[PDB]
Amino acid sequence: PGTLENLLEQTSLKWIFVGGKGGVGKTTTSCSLAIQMSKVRSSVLLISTDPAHNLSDAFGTKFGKDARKVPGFDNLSAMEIDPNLSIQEMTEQALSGMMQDLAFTIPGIDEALAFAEILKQIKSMEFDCVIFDTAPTGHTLRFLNFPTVLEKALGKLGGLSSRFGPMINQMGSIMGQDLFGKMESMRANISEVNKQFKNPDLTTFVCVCISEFLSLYETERMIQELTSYEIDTHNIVVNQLLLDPNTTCPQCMARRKMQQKYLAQIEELYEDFHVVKVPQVPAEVRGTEALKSFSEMLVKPYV
Amino acid sequence: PGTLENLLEQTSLKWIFVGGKGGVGKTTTSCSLAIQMSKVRSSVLLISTDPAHNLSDAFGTKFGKDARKVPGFDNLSAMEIDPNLSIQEMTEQALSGMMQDLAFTIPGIDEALAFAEILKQIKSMEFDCVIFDTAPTGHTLRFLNFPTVLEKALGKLGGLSSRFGPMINQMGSIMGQDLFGKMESMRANISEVNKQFKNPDLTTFVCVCISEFLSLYETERMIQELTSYEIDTHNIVVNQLLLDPNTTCPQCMARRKMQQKYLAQIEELYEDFHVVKVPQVPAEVRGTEALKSFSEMLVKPYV
Ligand SMILES: [Zn+2]
Numbered sequence: 001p002g003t004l005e006n007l008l009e010q011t012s013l014k015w016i017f018v019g020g021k022g023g024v025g026k027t028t029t030s031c032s033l034a035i036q037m038s039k040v041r042s043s044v045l046l047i048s049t050d051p052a053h054n055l056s057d058a059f060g061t062k063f064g065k066d067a068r069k070v071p072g073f074d075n076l077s078a079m080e081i082d083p084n085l086s087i088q089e090m091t092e093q094a095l096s097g098m099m100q101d102l103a104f105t106i107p108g109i110d111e112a113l114a115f116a117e118i119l120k121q122i123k124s125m126e127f128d129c130v131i132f133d134t135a136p137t138g139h140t141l142r143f144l145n146f147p148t149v150l151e152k153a154l155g156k157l158g159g160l161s162s163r164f165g166p167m168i169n170q171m172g173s174i175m176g177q178d179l180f181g182k183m184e185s186m187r188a189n190i191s192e193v194n195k196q197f198k199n200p201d202l203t204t205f206v207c208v209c210i211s212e213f214l215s216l217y218e219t220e221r222m223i224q225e226l227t228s229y230e231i232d233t234h235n236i237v238v239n240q241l242l243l244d245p246n247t248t249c250p251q252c253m254a255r256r257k258m259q260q261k262y263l264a265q266i267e268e269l270y271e272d273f274h275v276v277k278v279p280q281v282p283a284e285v286r287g288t289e290a291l292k293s294f295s296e297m298l299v300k301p302y303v
Numbered sequence: 304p305g306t307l308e309n310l311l312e313q314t315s316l317k318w319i320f321v322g323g324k325g326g327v328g329k330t331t332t333s334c335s336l337a338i339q340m341s342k343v344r345s346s347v348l349l350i351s352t353d354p355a356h357n358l359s360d361a362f363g364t365k366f367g368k369d370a371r372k373v374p375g376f377d378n379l380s381a382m383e384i385d386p387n388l389s390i391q392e393m394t395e396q397a398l399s400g401m402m403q404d405l406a407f408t409i410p411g412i413d414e415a416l417a418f419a420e421i422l423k424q425i426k427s428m429e430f431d432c433v434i435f436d437t438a439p440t441g442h443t444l445r446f447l448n449f450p451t452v453l454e455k456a457l458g459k460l461g462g463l464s465s466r467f468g469p470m471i472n473q474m475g476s477i478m479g480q481d482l483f484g485k486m487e488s489m490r491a492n493i494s495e496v497n498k499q500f501k502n503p504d505l506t507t508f509v510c511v512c513i514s515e516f517l518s519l520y521e522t523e524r525m526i527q528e529l530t531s532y533e534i535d536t537h538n539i540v541v542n543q544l545l546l547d548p549n550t551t552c553p554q555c556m557a558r559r560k561m562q563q564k565y566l567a568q569i570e571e572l573y574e575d576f577h578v579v580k581v582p583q584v585p586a587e588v589r590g591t592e593a594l595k596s597f598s599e600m601l602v603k604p605y606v
Pocket residue numbers: 249250251252253552553554555556
């Protein structure tokens with residue numbers, strides 16, 4: 001059933017992550033999906049952790065570390081956050097010394113503590129549905145893994161005596177009085193996030209790729225890593241493929257040949273996924289009108 | 304100076320590795336380079352560890368786990384070896400039980416012990432120059448890393464008492480009498496391979512990719528991993544890019560646009576690399592005549 005209709009239908013969904021090892025029209029897909037979702041929900045938020053301010057470049061507007069209604073829509077808001085900044089913002093704002101001694105034993109607690117607060121903010125703004133646009137490189141899933149990283153750090157801190165009262169209490173506030181209980185009440189906060197992430201009724205993931213060898217490979221490794229993280233996934237959009245059955249360009253014919261044999265592999269490996277196919281647009285997709293028209297092919301199979 | 308001339312010139316070169324995260328005409332490049340090298344050297348060998356028997360599919364002939372002169376050339380021989388086979392071949396040929404208890408502490412000693420013997424064979428056949436065609440997926444550099452893996456295992460064995468005499472002596476033969484010295488004489492054999500690998504006069508590496516985002520990313524990670532392994536590298540060939548300045552196909556124009564902006568990034572990041580650009584061929588490159596004609600563009604810039 002090659003269309004993202006099943007996301008607009010499932011109204012229980014609160015978080016939808018979209019990701020794919022960059023260079024595959026991932027950003028266009030995130031946007032197109034956010035627009036379509038805004039037509040059928042009360043309040044939609046589109047957040048991106050791609051530092052390349054890809055979200056701005058797409059809508060024309062400039063977005064930043066706080067929610068701004070998107071020009072052209074009633075209920076769609078968008079924010080564009082970089083973790084490396086949110087890290088140095090929150091640390092100087094304090095202790096991190098201790099967190100450093102934590103930082104080498106636990107790689108990426110800083111990146112994870114960031115994500116922890118980013119989320120608490122999103123939750124507080126109460127959007128009916130939020131679409132996460134993951135980074136195009138490195139660990140595309142850092143965000144979904146942040147409870148894991150925190151929980152490790154909490155295991156290392158449990159065995160620590162007092163005198164770390166400062167940093168335990170310091171971590172506790174950036175997430176959400178005193179005692180060892182507050183050390184066990186974070187564990188309850190973490191357990192909460194995990195529950196939601198891992199609950200198919202509430203949060204699912206949509207992979208995007210292109211019909212080439214390397215992109216298939218990196219995409220499989222991502223789906224394995226996902227089922228491993230216990231995050232649900234049942235959609236996969238394949239972009240910039242060219243499907244004019246009778247094309248005359250000798251090159252485009254070669255391209256189409258290769259593409260069509262990998263698209264055949266995909267169709268077969270993922271019987272259990274809505275695999276949606278969308279064409280290569282000659283012009284770069286830009287502007288709140290080009291985007292609207294493009295989002296069409298995500299809900300209506302293209303021929 | 305966009306051409307692989309500098310490899311035909313450097314006659315001190317004994318090993319040339321070519322690799323790239325598959326789907327980028329890597330095999331065609333390895334061959335084209337082997338042909339050109341055969342014109343200017345006494346004896347050239349082209350070996351591939353790509354299990355997909357990509358080397359056979361390219362020449363038409365069938366190659367296997369031993370050197371066969373290539374139909375159409377005087378001094379060019381080719382062999383096509385799969386490690387997973389060479390592993391079970393060499394182990395049953397024995398002890399591995401011990402090696403297993405080694406196998407989990409040291410991941411991939413079996414794959415590295417294999418490479419150790421593959422190399423001793425190549426060395427014995429005394430080719431003037433040998434071109435290695437690396438696998439298209441996973442760790443493309445396992446081969447250059449085999450001394451490292453061995454040296455770890457030798458550190459774990461040094462602290463072991465006698466009674467491992469069997470496996471120490473068993474390892475010693477697959478590489479190249481008795482005592483603790485034989486345990487220290489492998490160390491000298493390993494140190495030898497490392498010296499050669501790391502010596503720019505003797506062995507260099509050539510990266511191949513295509514002008515897309517994902518292929519650039521994986522290629523950078525590979526060059527970093529290289530300088531880390533201390534292996535020299537100063538060539539990079541970019542394939543299947545289409546360079547007819549004035550093309551009329553709307554799609555090919557789009558492709559070319561994207562391509563040309565990433566080719567711009569490459570040209571800039573690698574001032575210190577011979578970056579050679581070669582076109583997209585409409586037909587699949589096959590046969591000892593199509594290959595000869597293609598190898599042309601690796602030594603003579605194409606326009
Ligand atoms: Zn074309």
